[PDB]
Scaffold this active site. Structure first.
Site, PDB file in Angstrom:
ATOM      1  N   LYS A  17       0.818  -1.218   0.000  1.00  0.00           N
ATOM      2  CA  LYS A  17       0.000   0.000   0.000  1.00  0.00           C
ATOM      3  C   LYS A  17       0.854   1.271   0.000  1.00  0.00           C
ATOM      4  N   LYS A  36      13.178  -0.437   1.226  1.00  0.00           N
ATOM      5  CA  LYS A  36      11.744  -0.154   1.227  1.00  0.00           C
ATOM      6  C   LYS A  36      11.481   1.357   1.168  1.00  0.00           C
ATOM      7  CE  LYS A  36       7.565  -1.018   4.146  1.00  0.00           C
ATOM      8  NZ  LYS A  36       6.999  -1.958   5.174  1.00  0.00           N
ATOM      9  N   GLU A  85      17.036  -6.462   5.682  1.00  0.00           N
ATOM     10  CA  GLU A  85      17.585  -7.754   5.245  1.00  0.00           C
ATOM     11  C   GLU A  85      16.859  -8.229   3.986  1.00  0.00           C
ATOM     12  OE1 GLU A  85      16.997 -10.790   8.208  1.00  0.00           O
ATOM     13  OE2 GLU A  85      17.541 -12.443   6.880  1.00  0.00           O
ATOM     14  N   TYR A  86      17.622  -8.654   2.966  1.00  0.00           N
ATOM     15  CA  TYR A  86      17.044  -9.191   1.712  1.00  0.00           C
ATOM     16  C   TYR A  86      16.661 -10.659   1.920  1.00  0.00           C
ATOM     17  CZ  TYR A  86      17.579 -11.489  -3.051  1.00  0.00           C
ATOM     18  OH  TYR A  86      17.449 -12.276  -4.189  1.00  0.00           O
ATOM     19  N   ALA A  87      15.435 -11.035   1.528  1.00  0.00           N
ATOM     20  CA  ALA A  87      14.961 -12.425   1.624  1.00  0.00           C
ATOM     21  C   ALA A  87      14.913 -13.043   0.220  1.00  0.00           C
ATOM     22  CB  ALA A  87      13.575 -12.489   2.290  1.00  0.00           C
ATOM     23  N   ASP A 130      -0.628  -8.179  11.973  1.00  0.00           N
ATOM     24  CA  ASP A 130      -0.781  -8.195  10.505  1.00  0.00           C
ATOM     25  C   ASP A 130      -0.066  -9.396   9.883  1.00  0.00           C
ATOM     26  OD1 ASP A 130      -1.826  -7.188   8.057  1.00  0.00           O
ATOM     27  OD2 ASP A 130      -0.163  -5.789   7.769  1.00  0.00           O
ATOM     28  N   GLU A 134       1.546 -12.422   2.573  1.00  0.00           N
ATOM     29  CA  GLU A 134       2.390 -11.470   1.817  1.00  0.00           C
ATOM     30  C   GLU A 134       3.431 -10.788   2.719  1.00  0.00           C
ATOM     31  OE1 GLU A 134      -0.740  -9.337  -0.069  1.00  0.00           O
ATOM     32  OE2 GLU A 134      -1.760  -9.086   1.844  1.00  0.00           O
ATOM     33  N   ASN A 135       3.265 -10.934   4.032  1.00  0.00           N
ATOM     34  CA  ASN A 135       4.240 -10.450   5.033  1.00  0.00           C
ATOM     35  C   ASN A 135       5.119 -11.549   5.643  1.00  0.00           C
ATOM     36  OD1 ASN A 135       3.255  -7.817   4.715  1.00  0.00           O
ATOM     37  ND2 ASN A 135       1.887  -7.953   6.481  1.00  0.00           N
ATOM     38  N   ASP A 148       7.221  -6.803   7.909  1.00  0.00           N
ATOM     39  CA  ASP A 148       6.198  -5.739   7.889  1.00  0.00           C
ATOM     40  C   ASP A 148       5.606  -5.446   9.286  1.00  0.00           C
ATOM     41  OD1 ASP A 148       4.445  -3.777   7.135  1.00  0.00           O
ATOM     42  OD2 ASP A 148       3.271  -4.957   5.701  1.00  0.00           O
TER      43      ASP A 148
END
Ligand SMILES: Nc1ncnc2c1ncn2[C@@H]1O[C@H](COP(=O)(O)OP(=O)(O)O)[C@@H](O)[C@H]1O
Ligand SMILES: N#CC[NH+]1CCN(c2cccc(Cl)c2)CC1
Ligand SMILES: [Mg+2]
Ligand SMILES: [Mg+2]
EC number: 2.7.11.1
Length: 265
Positions: A17, A36, A85-87, A130, A134-135, A148
């Site tokens: 969002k 982000k 951190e990149y996942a 939350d 998607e998180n 998130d």
């Protein structure tokens, strides 16, 4: 300290969002990470500055293998940048869209990893609020990490901010705007367990209005293929009365979890 000029930007990793998230490499160290990006005009318009502060403050101090790291941040008068951190293996959401449904071993393993991460969070009286596919991100060895933290808070709590999108993962006390605590994340863990095994969440519906009705009345049923052990755990978590929902130790020790998970507490 950090500024945009310190990074080379690469491919888009995802959108939320508010967040547009990009792969990035820091120029002097060649460190790979996820940036982000939030637009200040959108944050101000929605009045969610406080959510952003909580995301940064809460997430930067947590240290757990199953929780995504936040390393730092900066801003430049049109944008705010969070250094994450990149996942590398993407979201649980994408894996569910690929496979349609997860088997019992995959599901129980993900639930173990979530329960460990949440157990750590709740020991600091942090509630996430939350938790949804998607998180939930995936590390290089396929391990689940919670991300998130924009909706996270300290318990107990009411809600001061407008609910945005889907109601699907929220308990009755949150959707009814009542007062809530740690047990909200246990309800969401039950919704996730169902969605992992079945392929859709248990109160899904065509309109907001009917979804609301199904959640407040706890109207769910099981397809024939869901086993007795999975049904027992899910039914224990989706209780209208939050005080009747189990403790996380009880989830981690449930016989269906111990029989099927390939990771420990
Ligand atoms: N650290 C990361 N590594 C890889 N992909 C990510 C990472 N963070 C976010 N994403 C992708 O970007 C999406 C949105 O990020 P998120 O932090 O959840 O933003 P929002 O607060 O707007 O929901 C995620 O659902 C995922 O697809
Ligand atoms: N719109 C807007 C104004 N912003 C609100 C919150 N801000 C914030 C909070 C935590 C970390 C970082 Cl880098 C920035 C910066 C400015
Ligand atoms: Mg998100
Ligand atoms: Mg957010």
């Amino acid at each position: 300290q950090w500024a945009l000029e310190d990074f080379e930007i690469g491919r888009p990793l995802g959108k939320g969002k508010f967040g547009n998230v990009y792969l990035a490499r820091e120029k002097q160290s060649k460190f790979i990470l996820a940036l982000k990006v939030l637009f200040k005009a959108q944050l101000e318009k929605a009045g969610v500055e406080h959510q952003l502060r909580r995301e940064v403050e809460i997430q930067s101090h947590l240290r757990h293998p199953n929780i995504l790291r936040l390393y730092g941040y900066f801003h430049d008068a049109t944008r705010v940048y969070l250094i994450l951190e990149y996942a590398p293996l993407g979201t649980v959401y994408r894996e569910l869209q690929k496979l349609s449904k997860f088997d019992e071993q995959r599901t129980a393993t993900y639930i173990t990893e979530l329960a460990n991460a949440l157990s750590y969070c709740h020991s600091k009286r942090v509630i996430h609020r939350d938790i949804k596919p998607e998180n939930l991100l995936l590390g290089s060895a396929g391990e689940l990490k919670i991300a998130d933290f924009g909706w996270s808070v300290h318990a107990p709590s009411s809600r001061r901010t407008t609910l945005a999108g889907t109601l699907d993962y929220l308990p009755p006390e949150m959707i009814e705007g009542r007062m809530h605590d740690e047990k909200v994340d246990l309800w969401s863990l039950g919704v996730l367990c169902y969605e992992f095994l079945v392929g859709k969440p248990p109160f899904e519906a065509n309109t907001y209005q009917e979804t609301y009705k199904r959640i407040s009345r706890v109207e769910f049923t099981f397809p024939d293929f869901v086993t007795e052990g999975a049904r027992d755990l899910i039914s224990r978590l989706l209780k209208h009365n939050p005080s009747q929902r189990p403790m996380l130790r009880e989830v981690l020790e449930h016989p269906w979890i111990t029989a099927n998970s390939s990771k420990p507490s």
